[PDB]
Amino acid sequence: MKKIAVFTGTRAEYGLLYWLMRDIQQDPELELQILATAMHYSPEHGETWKTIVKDGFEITESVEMLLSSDTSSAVVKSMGVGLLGFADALKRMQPDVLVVLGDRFEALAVTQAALIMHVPVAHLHGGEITEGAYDESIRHAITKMSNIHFAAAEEYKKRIIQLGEQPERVFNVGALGLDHIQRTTFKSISELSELYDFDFSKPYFLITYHPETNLLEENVAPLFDALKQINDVNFIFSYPNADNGNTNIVKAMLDLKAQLPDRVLLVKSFGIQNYLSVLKNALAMVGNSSSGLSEAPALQVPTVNIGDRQKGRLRCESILDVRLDENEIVEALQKAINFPPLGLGNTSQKIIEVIKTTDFKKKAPFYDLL
Amino acid sequence: MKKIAVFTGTRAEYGLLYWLMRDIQQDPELELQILATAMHYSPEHGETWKTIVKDGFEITESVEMLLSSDTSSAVVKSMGVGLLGFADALKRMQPDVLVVLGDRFEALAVTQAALIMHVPVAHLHGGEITEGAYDESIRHAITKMSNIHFAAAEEYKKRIIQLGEQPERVFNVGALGLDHIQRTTFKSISELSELYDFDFSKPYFLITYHPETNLLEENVAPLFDALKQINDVNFIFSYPNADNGNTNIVKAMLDLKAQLPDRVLLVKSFGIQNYLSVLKNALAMVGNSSSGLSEAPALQVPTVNIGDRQKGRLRCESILDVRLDENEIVEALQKAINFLGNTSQKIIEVIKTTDFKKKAPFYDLL
Amino acid sequence: MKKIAVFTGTRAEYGLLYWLMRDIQQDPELELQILATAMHYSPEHGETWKTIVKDGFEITESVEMLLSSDTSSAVVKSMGVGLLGFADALKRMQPDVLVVLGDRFEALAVTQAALIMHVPVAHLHGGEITEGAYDESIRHAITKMSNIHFAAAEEYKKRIIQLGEQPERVFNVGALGLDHIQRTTFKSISELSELYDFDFSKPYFLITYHPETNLLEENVAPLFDALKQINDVNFIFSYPNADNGNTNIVKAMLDLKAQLPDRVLLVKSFGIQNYLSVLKNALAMVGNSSSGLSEAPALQVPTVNIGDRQKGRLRCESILDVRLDENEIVEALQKAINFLGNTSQKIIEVIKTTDFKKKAPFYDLL
Amino acid sequence: MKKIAVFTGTRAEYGLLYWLMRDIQQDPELELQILATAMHYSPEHGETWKTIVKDGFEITESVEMLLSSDTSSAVVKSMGVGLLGFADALKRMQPDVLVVLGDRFEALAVTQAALIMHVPVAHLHGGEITEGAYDESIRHAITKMSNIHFAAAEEYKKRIIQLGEQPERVFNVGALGLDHIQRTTFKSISELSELYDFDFSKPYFLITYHPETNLLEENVAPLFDALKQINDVNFIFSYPNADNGNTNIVKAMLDLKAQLPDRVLLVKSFGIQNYLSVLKNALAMVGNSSSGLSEAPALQVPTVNIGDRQKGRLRCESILDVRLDENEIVEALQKAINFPPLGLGNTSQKIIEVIKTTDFKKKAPFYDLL
Ligand SMILES: O=c1ccn([C@@H]2O[C@H](COP(=O)(O)OP(=O)(O)O)[C@@H](O)[C@H]2O)c(=O)[nH]1
Fold first, then answer.
1. Which residues are UDP 3-binding (chains A, D) (predicted)?
2. Which end of chain A is more exposed for a tag (fewer CB within 10 A), N or C?
3. Cβ–Cβ contact B21 with A under 8 A
4. A137 in a domain, yes or no?
5. Which among A72, A83, A118 has the least Cβ separation from residue B117?
6. Domain containing D299: what range?
7. E strand spans, chain D
8. Considering only CB atoms, which chain B residues are within 8 Å of D71?
9. Shortest CA distance to C249 belongs to which of C300, C200, C211?
C-alpha cells in the first residue's frame, strides 16, 4: 500500500489533478493523501478547500500560509509559513510519493521540503515554457528537485532531459487535465439551453479572456468591437479571475451584453462539465485562456489565441494566433467559421502505471548530453 | 552607484567570498551590502559573524534561522524562518544584485526570496556535481533561479548552459576561493602552534567530515576507527556544518578527543587564513569537504575523500577516493603519508559590463 | 536623546495614539520610532500605513503579518509571523521604551517580544473589561507584561493595581484619543459629502461591528435585518477588524449594500479626522466598537452597543446596550432617532521623569 | 471521553507532570494527548522527547521551535515558530482541555494560541513569585489567559484570586511534583550503596547548586570552604543544569572531590527515584535548588537555602535561609545537624476530580475585590 500524497494549492490546479486523485482513491493498492494549502484557504476565492471535501476527498493535512497582502515580500513570508507547515505536515504524513504539479511558489516550497526530508517528488507539467516574472524559473527549479517527471508532451519531456534528468525518469503521459475530456458525459444542446434559458442551437463563440497581469495597457475594446463587426454568431462568456485588470474586462463584457441581450450569455462559473459541453459545439474558443490551447484542440474546436498570455505553449493547427487590435482578429474568427501533442486524455492511468512499476526513491545521477 | 549585496551563511563560503567582498568594498563605484545568516549566528558553529565584523566588513542585515533540533524537518523549518527574515531584509537593502555562492539550503531560501522579490541573482559555483548531498538538486535549482552565472571550470559552464541558461549569461572565471592562494598571507608552524596551543610541528591530518545528506543511515565510525590505527600522527578537526546529521559527527569527534587528548585538536571554525595555513602543512586533507577537491590540490596536499558527498566533481592524481570503510580509509591514509588568480576582478567586471536584471529565456540545445 | 517606539497595528489605535506620537515628534529630547504592522498592511483593511505616512510620520519598521485565512488558527499563525518580524525590528530599533495601546492579538505578540528582549513597555488603556472578546485576557496579560501603565479612568487604574502592579507605576491620565476632541479640526458636512461622493446632509447611522470573538457561533443577521426595518435613514459603515470571523460581517455588509445601494456607504478606512467628523454628524454610533464607549458619548452622539464585546467598560448616559436581537436593535435605533485634551502631555511627562526599565515586584493588596 | 492534552517543553517540567500524565493515561474516562516542544528537541539536552516515549507515553504532536542561538531576538523567533506549529497542532488535536505548567515562554505561546482557538487552559503553579528577568511576568500573563487554575498552596491560590480570577476557578491542590514522594518505592541504603559503589551509611549532605543565572559568574568558594570545615560528614552532589556559568561550578565540585577521593560522591543524573531515595536519608538538602523548598521539607529533611535563586517561594520551619557567606553557611549546616503548604502528594487525583466535575469552557468574568 504505497502512500501517494497529492499536493494542491489552487482550485484550478486541483481541477487538473482531480482524476488522478480519483483514480488513486479508487485503487485499493494506493492510499491517497492530500496536502491542501495556499489559495484553498483564501476568502478571496471562497475557501475552495471545501470543494475538495464536497467532491468526496479527505484533506489529510492543511497548511494556511498566504499573507493578506499584495507585496512580493509578503509572498516570501507566505512561502516561509508554507515551509514551516510543510515540515510538520510531511513529518506526520510520511508519504511514499509526493505529487506536485505546476510552477507556483508553494509547490517549490513543498518540493524542497520533500527533498530535504527524502520524500520522492513526482512533478507534473515540467519542461514547459510560459511567461511571467519568474513562473518558468520556478518550474525548472521544481524539476531539478524532483525524482520523477511526467511531461505533457514529447518536447517538454526532452527539455526535461536537457535539464539533466535521466531519460528513465521522464515520461510523456499527456496533460492530466485532458482526462476530463475523456471522462465527461457531455450535456446535449437541449440540456445546456434549458439549464441556462438561452438557445445554444444558434451558432456561438465561447470566450474566456483573462487579465494580462503584466500588460497594464489592457485596452479591452479591440476585441469586442471586433465581435460587433462579425454577425450571425452568438457570444457566450464566463468571467475572469482575480488579477490586475479584472473589472476593466468584466464591464467591457457586460455592456456588450446590455447592447445585445439576444446574442450574449453570461455565466459566472460554468463547472468543468458544462464548460466542456459548451466548448464542444463551438466554432471558436477565443481569448487567452489555457483551455484554448488544450481542451479546445482536443475537442476539434478551433481556437483564436489573442495576446501573449499563452505564448510559449505548444501550438497546433486549431490555434490561430493574433494580437489585441481589431483587424487581425476577425480574419481569425472567420478563419474559425470556414473550416495532438498533449495526448488523448488517459494521463492518470499512465502516471499510476509508472509509479507502480518504477523505483525513484533516490534522485538519479545528473544526465550530461554527449 | 550600484548596490552589490553578498549573501553568506557559513564561515566556509564567506572565506570563499572574502576577496569579492573586499574588492567591492574597495571599489568606489560599488556599494557592498552583506546578508549574513544561518551558521554565522549559531554558537555550536562558532558565531562566525564576529569574524565578518573583525575583517572590517559591515553586516547590513542579520537573520537568525537555524533550529537546534538535528532533523530534516528542523532544516525545513530553519529555511522557513530564513525566508521570513529575508523578506524584510531584502525589502530593506533593496540590492541592485544579490551574489549567492554554493548549494546549501539557506542559499536556496535566499535565492528564491530574491527571485520572488525581483532581485537579480549572481550565482557562483554552479554546474558542479555532488551526488551524495541534496546540495546537488539545490545547486541546480539555484542555477535555474539565477540571472547571471560565474562557473569555476569550463565543464561547469557547459553544464550550466545545458541547464537552459543563455551562454551569454555564463562565465568561466575560476574558483573565487583560490584567489587566496595568491592574495592571502599564510601563517607559519609556530604561529598556528602558539595561537592554537597545539604542536603543529608534529605531523597531522586535517579532517572535515560533513553529513552526506542522501545517506539513509550514516555511521561515521569507520572513519574514526581508521584514524586510531595511524600512529605518531595527530588529528585536527573542523566542525561539521549545520546540515541534519551533524551532531553524530560531533559526538564521534568529542569521543576521539576524549580518548586521545594529546593528539586531537577540535576547532569549531579556523579563520580560513588559519585554515589554509593548517591545510598547507597537513599530511592530507581528510573527509568529504569541497576543500579537498580544490584548495588541497592547489596547495599540493593529498585528499582522502570519503563517501559520495563529493562524487561528480573534477578529479586529479592527488585525490584518493575511498568509501566510508575502515580498511579503505586506513590504506588511503598511509598512502597519503607515503608519496591565474584574478577571479574577483573578472566577476566584478562582468557585473559592471552586463545587464542581467532579467532572466534570459530558456536556452534549448541545437 | 531617549528613544520612544510607538507600536501600531490598526488605523483605530493609530488614531488613538496620534497626539502622543506627534508630541513625541515635536519634543527635541525624544526620538520617535514607529513599529507599524498587522491591519496597516492588509488591502482588506485599507492599507492604512499610507495614512501614517501622509500625516508626516516616518515608519521606522514595518512588519507584514496577517494571514488571509479567516480562522482562529490563522490568527495564531499571524501572531507567529508577527513575532518573527518583531524580533529583528526590535533588534534594530533598540528602543528605550515601547508604547503599546490596547488589547489586540498583535499587541500581545509585540508586548511579549519586547518583554523577552528587555524593552520596557508603557501600556495604555489597561484595567478595562471587554468580556465578550478574547481581547480581555489579552489586555490583562499585556498589563502583567508591561512596566508602566497609563489608565483612562480611576476604576481602570484601580483594577490595574489589583492585578499586582505597583501603584507608583499606574497613572490615571485619561483617554488619549479624546485629545482629538480638543486638538483636531473637524470636517464640515459639505466636505464630508464631497470627498466620499455621499450626501451626509441626510440622516445616517454610523455602523461598526467587529466579530465578538468569545461567541461560539456568530450570526450578524439580526443587526442587518434590524437596520433594513428603518426607513428614511442612511447606513454608513467602516469595515470590521482582522479578528477571525470578520469576513461574514463583510459579506453581510456587501449584501446590505447590494440591496439598498443608494442608502448604504461602505468605507474601508476613513481618516479619523474624517471618522470623528462623520461620527459627530451621525444619528447614532451603532455596533460594538469601543468608540461607542468613548468618542461617541464625548461628541454627544448616542450609541447602540450590541453584544458583549464592550461588556464591562464604563457606561455613559447615552449608551443603549442591546443584545444581538432584531427587536431590541430596532427599538434602540428608533429611540436613538427620537432624542480635557492633555493626556499626551501627561504621558510624555511621566515617561520623561520616571524610571520603569525594570518591572516592579508584584503588588500584594495589604 | 474528555480529551486532555498535556503541554511539555522541558525534561524537568515533564518530570513534574509525570504522575498526572500517568493518571490520565490509566483513567478510561480521559484520553491523554501530549504536545511536546521546545527543549525536548534540543540536542544540548539529549532530545528528552525520547524519555517521554521510553516512559511509555505517546507524543500526539511535536513542534520543533528553539533556534540555535543565545540572543533574546532568537527567543522571540523561537516563540514565533512555536506559535506557527501550535496553530496546526491544536487544530489537529482539538483538545477538550489543555494543561500548562510553569512560566516558560513556550507555555505562554501555547496558552495564548489555545485562548485564540477556544481550547480551555488549566494552568498549574500560577500565583507564585520567583526571581528572574521576566519569568514571573510570563507566569501572571499565563494566569490571565487560563480558564482554570491549580495552585500549589493557599497563598498562591489567593494571589491568583487577586489577579482577577474567580474563586470557583482556583483550586489549591498542592505541588504536582511531590506526587513522586507519595508514589516512590525508595531504595534502601544497601541498594543505593552498591548501585553507586559508595557507602551511604556514613552521614552525607546532598547538594544541588545551580548557577544563579543572574549571578553571571559566581564565587563558589564561600560554600565549599564551609563544607571542608564540616568533618565526619560526606558530600553527595548531582550536576547543575545548562546555563551561563555552570562550568566553574562543575570544576569547583570536581576539585573538592579530587582532594577527598574517599568522602565525596558525584552523580551526573540521579533519576527521580534514586534522587528522592538519596535525599530521604540525607542530613540536609543544601544549595539553591527548588527541591530544597518542596521535596526536602516533604521528606522532613532540613534545607540550607543559599542565595536568592529561590527568593519568593514559601518558607517553612525546615527551611534555613543563608547568603553566600562562608560563616553564615557554617552555622546553618550545624543547625541542620541539630534538629506543609505544598501538600502531601496527591495532587494529580485532585486535579483530575476537579476537571471531571467543573465546567470551564469559557473564561469567567473578571473578579473585582470590592
Ligand atoms: O570549521 C571550519 C570548517 C570549514 N571552514 C572552511 O570551509 C571551507 C571548505 O570546507 P567546507 O566543508 O566547509 O565546504 P563544503 O564542503 O561544504 O563545500 C574552507 O575554505 C574552510 O576555510 C572553516 O573555515 N572552518
1. 210, 270-271, 275, 290-291, 295, 309-310
2. C
3. no
4. yes
5. A72
6. 191-341
7. 2-8, 30-37, 61-63, 97-101, 121-124, 148-151, 170-172, 204-208, 234-238, 264-267, 285-287, 303-306, 319-322
8. 41, 64
9. C211
Place of cell 473585582: D368
By most ligand atoms within 8 Å of CB, the mutation choice from B238, B273, B280 for ligand 1 is B238
CB-based contact, D242 to chain C, within 8 Å: no
3-state secondary structure of D189: helix
**Resolution limit, Å:** 2.5
Residues A82, A106: one domain? yes
Question: According to the entry, how was the structure determined?
Answer: X-ray
- Please indicate if any CB of chain B lies within 8 Å of the CB of A82: yes
Backbone angles phi, psi at D356, to 5 degrees: -70, -25
Q: Is residue B27 part of a domain?
A: yes
> Could you tell me if C89 and C2 lie in one domain?
yes
Q: Is D163 helix (H, G, I), strand (E, B) or coil?
A: coil
Taking the C-alpha atoms of residue C218 and residue A15, their distance in angstroms, rounded to an integer, is: 33
Q: Residue A73 is nearest to which of B72, B117, B359, comparing CB atoms?
A: B117
CB pairs under 8 A between B and D: 53
Nearest to A117 by CA among C286, B213, B44: B213
- CB B88 within 8 Å of CB C88: yes
Neighbours of C154 (CB within 10 A): 11
Long-range contacts of D196-202 (CB under 8 A, 24+ apart): D196/D265, D196/D267, D198/D236, D198/D265, D200/D278, D200/D281, D202/D233, D202/D234
The helix (run of H) or strand (run of E) holding residue D181 is helix D179-183
Q: How many CB atoms lie within 10 A of CB A54?
A: 8
- Looking at beta carbons, which residues of chain D come within 8 Å of C136? 363, 366
Q: For residue C157, what are the contacts with CB-CB under 8 A and spacing of at least 6?
A: C127, C149, C151, C170, C171, C172
Name beta bridge partners: D235.
Answer: D205, D264
In a domain, residue A366? The reply is no
Q: Which atom of ligand 1 is nearest to the CA of B104?
A: 17
Q: Same domain, yes or no, for B3 and B149? A: yes
In a domain, C295, yes or no: yes
Query: Annotation-wise, does A78 bind a ligand?
Result: no
Write the residue in D67, D70, D71 that is nearest to B67 by C-beta.
Answer: D67
C99 and C196 share one domain: no
Is D125 marked within a binding site? yes
Tell whether ligand 1 has an atom less than 6 A from the beta carbon of residue B298.
Answer: no
Strands of chain A (E only): list them. Answer: 2-8, 30-37, 61-63, 97-101, 121-124, 148-151, 170-172, 204-208, 234-238, 264-267, 284-287, 303-306, 319-322
- Cell 520603569 maps to which residue? C356
Kindly give, in sequence order, each residue whose CB lies less than 8 Å from that of residue D317, ignoring residues fewer than 6 positions away.
Answer: none
Chain A partners within 8 Å of D88 (Cβ): 62-63, 85, 88-89
B186/B197 same-domain check: no
C-alpha cell at A136: 518558468
What do you get for the CA distance between the two ends of chain D, in Å? 39
Give CA separation, B342 vs A65, A94, B171, B178, B179, in Å.
Answer: 45, 49, 13, 9, 6
Kindly state whether residues A94 and A66 are assigned to the same domain.
yes
- The domain tally of chain C equals 2
Question: Is there a contact between A58 and B75 (Cβ–Cβ < 8 Å)?
Answer: no
- C62 to chain B: nearest residue by CA? B88
**Does residue C88 contact residue B63 with C-beta atoms inside 8 Å?**
yes
Q: Is there a single domain that holds both residue D167 and residue D51? A: yes
